[PDB]
């Protein structure tokens, strides 16, 4: 019934994504702040259901971006071998702060909630590609802050 | 009680108006953009039960106009003769995109929620001309996005 | 003329080897705390002169042993392919803190001071398989501090 | 000066209503008996300059009115196509009579006097929604005979 979240920045409990074992894979995501390449290494992690470093998609080409971005994965880690099937969580790493030295961070399962549907009759959040569940979020907040 | 609605854009489960069989109706269509006649050809369709065209209304007349406009269909077919009464969908093309050679799309049921009317006391959304309760409503997003 | 260096940890400014663009590398890394598999993923990270990863040594296998370990570099990234010739930084995490949440750190040109080396008449300090001179080092700490 | 007007049934020189191209028009109709659709088919006839018949308007759902009726045409022919502009004759035929085979007949500017209205000063006659001056009328005759 609430539409308030429309224009929030939502926080989900979904941070991976399944991997069927053969077919490539689709993501979104959330960068809050426009990429600047010459701030670190900016790059995507991809990891096994152990935490274990997968793949790592550099994201200097993107440079000057903001907001949702797609992806692919093809399903291979950094030999080019496929991976076992599973849930494989996705974060990023980018614009590394000077004084700090640490980076922003972003994954998936959060962003900008761009529209509300109601699946005859359950309400589901549209972030970017991802469409989840009201149950899903843990937070909300504006743009430009937290 | 909510009221979030306001000011959004809403998809509805109403894309049709019933035909009385006799009696010319009358009807709101949602620009989201303002229309452009030099732009293709753009015009409104209306269909029957089994999505065989019936009417073709043309929209060049209404160059510049955006948001909700009125319109009325006599119910008569292209020939000008009176159809079976029963429920007739409406969509609209126009702004041909020159890139992607593909019209915007609007149609009956959808448009800007303009206020929330409590009925005593069931929630009702104004859609131009239309009142349609808040279970019709299948999404909801900010105008100019989606 | 100072030998109380024996018996300390130093850290040096030798942060990377030299990879002739062909030939294998050997080199070693010192292990303050045993290495433990369960705790995290322990690895090595390669990292070119702009930091960027270049090769992933997984140190699971190594798991138990403690102290100064060799490890060897084909010169290869993941895929397989030889990397341009060029001074690269050999790190490592491993026993992620259960708490903190941070992997201990450990590198190339660390580690305990095994003995001194009177290269007549320059000082030099055997640190594993390294032999670096006396100026190098930049820090000195008893084991199991700092 | 003279108001012995009122009351009485005025023919008009007035016999035609100007269509602009564009804008549907509105005009009025006197019905000096019931309509009674079981006698014949009533209907309004449309015609252009050269009396070419250009829509026919049918009656049969006035059933049971008398007097002044309004009506309204968008200035389509039968087919839906908007007309040239110009002027055009309105007339209709209602009541067929069972013995003489004849209808009734009634047009544009021609019915009761309502009112006289003194435009400062020159006089006007109500007729319906029609405000003609005086000079227009070219005849007079009581309710119920000509």
Redesign the interface.
């Known amino acids: ?4 979240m ?2 929030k920045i939502a926080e989900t409990d979904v941070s991976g994504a399944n991997f069927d074992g053969n077919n490539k894979l689709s993501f979104s995501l959330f960068f809050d702040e426009k990429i600047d390449a010459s701030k ?2 900016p790059a995507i992690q991809i990891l096994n259901e ?4 997968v793949k ?1 998609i ?1 994201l200097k080409d993107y440079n000057g971006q903001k907001g949702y971005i797609n992806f692919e994965w093809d399903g291979t ?4 071998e496929k991976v076992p099937k599973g849930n494989y969580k996705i974060k990023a790493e980018y614009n590394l702060d000077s004084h700090s030295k640490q980076y922003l961070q972003t994954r998936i399962g959060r962003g900008e909630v ?5 699946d ?2 359950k309400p589901m959040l ?1 972030m970017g590609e991802m469409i989840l569940p009201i149950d899903s979020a843990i937070e909300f907040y504006k743009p430009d802050q937290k």
Do not use: A, D
Request: net charge neutral; aromatic share 4%; glycine share 16%.
């Open positions: 019934n609430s539409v308030s429309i224009g670190g290494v152990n935490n274990e470093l790592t550099p880690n950094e030999k080019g761009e529209s509300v549907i109601f005859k009759g549209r």
